[PDB]
Amino acid sequence: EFKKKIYLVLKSSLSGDEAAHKLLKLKIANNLKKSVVDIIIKSSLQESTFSKFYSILSERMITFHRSWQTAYNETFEQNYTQDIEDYETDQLRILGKFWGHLISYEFLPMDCLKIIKLTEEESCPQGRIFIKFLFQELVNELGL
Amino acid sequence: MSYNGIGLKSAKGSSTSGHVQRSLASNRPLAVQKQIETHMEKREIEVQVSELRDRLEEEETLSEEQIDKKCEALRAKLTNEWQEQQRMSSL
Amino acid sequence: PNLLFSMCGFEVRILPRQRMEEVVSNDEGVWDLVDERTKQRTAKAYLKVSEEEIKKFDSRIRGILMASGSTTFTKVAAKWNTSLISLFTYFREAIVATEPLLDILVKGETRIQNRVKLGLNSKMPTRFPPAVFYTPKELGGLGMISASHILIPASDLSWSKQTDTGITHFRAGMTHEDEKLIPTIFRYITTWENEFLDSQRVWAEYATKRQEAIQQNRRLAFEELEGSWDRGIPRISTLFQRDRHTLAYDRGHRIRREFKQYSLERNSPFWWTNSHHDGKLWNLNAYRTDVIQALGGIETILEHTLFKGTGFNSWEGLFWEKASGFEDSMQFKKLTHAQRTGLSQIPNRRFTLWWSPTINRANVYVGFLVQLDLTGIFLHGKIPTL
RNA sequence: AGUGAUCUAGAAAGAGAUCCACCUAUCAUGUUG
Ligand SMILES: [K+]
């Protein structure tokens, strides 16, 4: 029911500002914020492509309060450390562009990339494909 | 009716309640300085002459001409001492 | 610093990045222009729907209301859907920042619902919960698609006319007493920018697979392109269009389709796309699923209907005979104009009966009880079709 | 670090002529060499 509620908040909004406003007005408890970010990520991964709607939504949540920023920080490291093995190449494309966008504007600090360990043992094809899309977005937005 | 410029003129004809919510999502010493220093140095001489003038006038003992003479003498003395000091410093 | 133009109904404003005071992230409706030499984003193109196109949409809604004086409730809702889908699938992300269009969408959707309400001689809000209009056709609802249950951006109009004020406030759109968020059509249509970027991707992948397929002297298998089939502009699936051997000769098809406006009184609102050449450019099947969830599921929806009184075993067997009825047997016969106009009452009667527990609910604002002759039924208002 | 801003609501008598979103369609050949 909580997943449904958040999902319907997303699907009933025209813009990321509206979606962010509705979620913020829910006054979600601090322990549920990470699960809300997880629902937002999974919803964005159901789309056929990336969308600026999710980046704007996340950005407005992050800047509203520090508890949202930390929920996004740990959701990023959660995705790279545990969830990437469950993602197909389409989902990895969307996810890489999403996190690359948030990093490219410092909503997620570039220090979050400290968890990346480019080696033949501590990385997998899912993670390397994810890194590829993330950096591709970084170069497209910022330039070399 | 609007509040702080936000709302609709009226809810009538809008097909909505008109309810407004604040968005939670939005949140070489430049020659001119040397000229001022030189002016201040010459001014100190003229300040001493004026102070002497003030003392002599307040004592109401000397005519305006005698006071002018004593001021010109002090001016000449101090100007000569200054020219000698400038010649020595430049030397 | 801004270069402006209006083309094909889109209002466009190009602002180079080098001219911006600060570069801020944007929502859908602001295209990023990439410099193909550096592969870097160098300018933003803000989009809006032109005032002329906004007026054309409003005129199409007016045309529906003016024509549908004796139309069935389902055909009125279907016309609304056709116009709404035409608008959204054509303009997409340009709608996001066009506030006058959101206002017109709210009014249009309300007027379409009012046509049904007035057809039932009652505008009483509690008599028409969202389930009556948005429940899919297969569950006896009108199957309307919503775009106006969103929050409309609001900001000081004085400042808004001089500079971009952002979105500091929201004003309500369509609303209902029930605590439920109806999905908005826009969330189910991929924006044009994303379609174009994904198209460049899938078609470059296809070009590479095509060259390898000939290097191996193979043929590309139908499921060697699975996952890309429903992607690209044109859709990858068009490569295997059944009549492609004839359609290879179809030239000037876009201008021909647009010029149809001068030779045919009734034209498709999808004048801009040809499914033979472009493929299926949208898929709204997920909207029906999510609207059922938004309404509280089948259980909650059916609680508003006469379903329990039918004694029908399961909601699964609820197959509406959408292809036969008395009015279908009668439409061919020799009938007067009065007899033909009177046939539309039949499906309206079925619709009203299905939702009758809600249409004749006791919790109404005003309403003197009138007992129905020879029955113990009380009508809380005068509703002839019921 | 989360305050405020909430249209609507039915009766009588007349009227009404229709058309376009919309369920993914490669070898298998007996023998004679
Ligand atoms: K008459």
CA A107 to CA A43: how far, in whole Å? 20
Are A141 and A100 in contact by the 8 Å Cβ rule? The answer is yes
**Cα separation, C45 vs C15, whole angstroms:** 6
How far C307 CA sits from the closest chain A CA (Å)?
Answer: 25
Q: Whole-angstrom Cα distance, residue B77 to residue A130?
A: 90
**Which chain A residues are Cβ-neighbours of C34 within 8 angstroms?**
140
Residue C234: asked if its preceding bond is cis (omega within 30°), the reply is yes
The secondary structure of C18-34, three-state, reads HHCCCCCCCCCCEEEEE
Q: What residues of chain A lie within 8 A of the CB of B24, using their CB?
A: 20-21, 24-25, 64
Buried residues in C135-166 as b, exposed as e (16+ CB within 10 A)? bbeebbbbbbbbbbbbbbbbbeeeebeeeebb
- Separation of C121 CA from ligand 1 center, angstroms? 20
Q: Which residue of B has its CA nearest to C112?
A: B15
Q: Where are the alpha helices (DSSP H) in C312-344?
A: 326-330, 337-342
Q: Where are the alpha helices (DSSP H) in chain B?
A: 31-58, 64-90
A96, A136 contact by CB (below 8 A): yes
User: What does the block give as tokens for C371?
Assistant: 């007992």
Task: Say how far apart CA C231 and CA C237 lie, in whole Å.
Answer: 8
State the Cα torsion A9-C156-B17-C185 to the nearest 10°: -40
Minimum-distance CB partner of A13 among C30, C184, C293: C184
Edge-to-edge order in the sheet of strand C169-171? B20-22, C169-171, C152-154
Contact between C359 and C127 under an 8 Å Cβ cutoff? The reply is yes
Contact between C355 and C305 under an 8 Å Cβ cutoff? The reply is yes
Q: DSSP letter at C120?
A: T
Of all helices (H) and strands (E), which one includes residue C158?
A: helix C157-162
| Nearest-angstrom CA–CA distance, C131 and C129 | 5
Long-range contacts at C96-101 (CB < 8 A, ≥ 24 apart): C96/A14, C96/A15, C96/C27, C96/C28, C96/C29, C96/C47, C96/C186, C97/C29, C97/C46, C97/C47, C97/C48, C98/C48, C98/C49, C98/C54, C99/C152, C99/C153, C100/C51, C100/C54, C101/C49, C101/C54, C101/C57
Burial of C111 (0-12, 13-18, 19+ CB in 10 A): middle
Nucleotides on strand D with an atom closer than 7 A to protein CB? 1-12, 15-22, 24-26
Query: In chain B, which residues have their Cβ closer than 8 Å to the Cβ of C166?
Result: 26
Tokens of C245: 């051997």
**Terminus-to-terminus CA distance in chain B, angstroms?**
84
Task: Report CA(C110)–C1'(D11) in Å, whole number.
Answer: 23
- Please enumerate in sequence order all residues whose Cβ is within 8 A of that of C5, keeping only pairs 6 or more positions apart, or say none: C12
Interface membership of B19 toward A (CB under 8 Å) = no
Distance, in Å, from the CA atom of C290 to the CA atom of C296, rounded to the nearest integer, reads: 10
Nearest residue to nucleotide D25 when comparing alpha carbons to its C1'? C242
CA–CA distance from C200 to each of A94, A113, B72, C233 (Å)?
15, 29, 95, 8
Two structure tokens written together for A36: 């809300």
Torsion (CA) C252, C253, C255, C261 in degrees, nearest 10: 140
Distance between B25 CA and the closest CA of chain A, angstroms: 5
Three-class secondary structure of residue C372 per DSSP:
coil
Reduced to 3 states, what is the DSSP secondary structure of residue C377?
coil
First to last CA, chain C: 62
Q: What's the rounded Cα separation, in Å, for the pair C379 and C189?
A: 43
Sheet strands (E) in A7-140: none
- Residue closest to A72 by CA, chosen among A27, A115, A103, A118: A103
Nearest to C105 by CA among C87, C79, C131: C87
Q: Are B1 and B10 in contact (CB under 8 A)?
A: yes
Which residues from B are below 8 Å from A17, CB to CB? Answer: 23, 25-26
* Sign of torsion over alpha carbons A68, A74, A77, A82: negative
DSSP bridge partners of C14:
C3, C45
φ and ψ of B22, to 5 deg: -70, 135
Question: How would you classify the pairing of strands C30-35 and C10-16?
Answer: unpaired
Distance CA C377, CA C382 (A): 13
Contact of C339 with chain B, judged by CB distance below 8 Å, is answered with no
Task: Give the closest residue to C152 by CA, choosing from C89, C90, C93, C98.
Answer: C98
Per the structure, the residues numbered 317 to 346 in protein chain C that have their CB within 7 angstroms of any atom of strand D are: 337, 340-341
The tokens for B90 are 């430049």
The answer to whether the CB atoms of C158 and B4 lie below 8 A apart is no
B35 backbone dihedrals φ, ψ, rounded to 5°: -70, -35
Alpha-carbon distance of C275 to C72, in angstroms, equals 29
Adjacent-strand bridge partners of C30 = C46
Give the distance, in angstroms, between the CA of residue C224 and the centroid of all CA atoms in the same chain: 33
Cα C377 to chain centroid, rounded: 38
CA distance A17 to chain B (A): 6
CA distance B81 to B35: 20
List Cβ neighbours of A71 (8 Å cut-off, separation of 6 or more).
A33, A34, A36, A37
Chain C partners of A14 at a C-beta cutoff of 8 Å? 95-96, 102, 150-151, 184, 186-187
Q: Write the DSSP assignment of C201-221 as a string of letters.
A: HHHHHHHHHHHHHHHTTPPPP
| SS3 state at B27 | coil
Taking one residue from A and the other from C, the number of pairs with CB-CB distance under 8 angstroms is 97
How far does residue C337's CA lie from ligand 1's centre (Å)? 15
C-beta atoms surrounding C376 within 10 Å: 6
Residue with tokens 């809810």: B11
SS3 content of chain A, % helix, strand, coil (to 5): 75, 0, 25
Ligand 1 centroid–CA C13 distance in Å is 55
Tokens found for residue C239: 């490569």
d(CA C278, CA C236) in angstroms, rounded, equals: 9
Rounded-to-integer distance, Cα C172 and Cα C20, Å: 33
Rounded CA-CA distance A52/C29 in Å is 9
Enter the tokens of residue C234. Answer: 């044109």
CA dist B81 and A90 (Å) reads: 92
Residues 6+ apart with CB under 8 A from C196: C233
Cα of B89 to nearest chain C Cα, Å: 55
Q: How many CB atoms lie within 10 A of CB A104?
A: 19
Q: Name the nt closest to A25 by C-alpha to C1'.
A: D2
Q: For C175, which of B7, B16, B22 is closest by C-beta distance?
A: B16
Contact A21/B27, CB-based, under 8 Å? no
CA dist A67 → A24, B26, C177 (Å): 12, 17, 33
3-state secondary structure of C371: strand
Q: Which residues pair with C379 in a beta bridge?
A: C370
- A52-64 and A66-81 are packed helices; what angle lies between their axes, rounded to 10 degrees? 130
Spatial distance between the Cα atoms of C155 and C168, rounded to a whole number of angstroms: 6
CB atoms within 10 A of CB A126: 18
Kindly give the distance from the C-alpha atom of residue C386 to the centroid of ligand 1, in angstroms, as a whole number.
25
Q: How buried is C306 (Cβ within 10 angstroms: 0-12 exposed, 13-18 middle, 19+ buried)?
A: middle
C337, burial (CB in 10 Å: exposed 0-12, middle 13-18, buried 19+): exposed
Burial class (CB in 10 A: 0-12, 13-18, 19+), B19: middle
Distance CA C108, CA C64 (A): 10
Gap between the Cα atoms of A10 and C184, Å rounded: 9
C-alpha neighbours within 13 Å on the C-beta side of residue A65: 14
Contact criterion met (CB below 8 Å) for C169 and A19: no
**Quick check: B23 CB within 7 A of strand D?**
no
Interface of B with A in 27-56 (CB under 8 A): 27
Closest protein residue to D1 using CA and C1' atoms? A65
Distance from CA of B46 to the nearest CA of C (A): 56
Q: Name where chain B breaks: residue before each gap, C-N > 2.5 Å.
A: 27
Across the interface, whether the CB atoms of A48 and C40 are under 8 A apart is answered no
- Is C349 within 7 A of strand D by CB distance? no
**Ligand 1 center–CA C119 separation, angstroms:** 19
Identify the three-state secondary structure at position A6.
Answer: helix
* Cα distances (Å, whole numbers) of residue A4 to A9, C283, C298: 9, 22, 15
> Nearest chain B Cα to A61, which residue?
B25
- Cβ proximity of C279 and C238 under 8 Å: yes
In chain B, what are the domain boundaries? 2-83
CA A90 – CA A47 distance, rounded (Å): 10
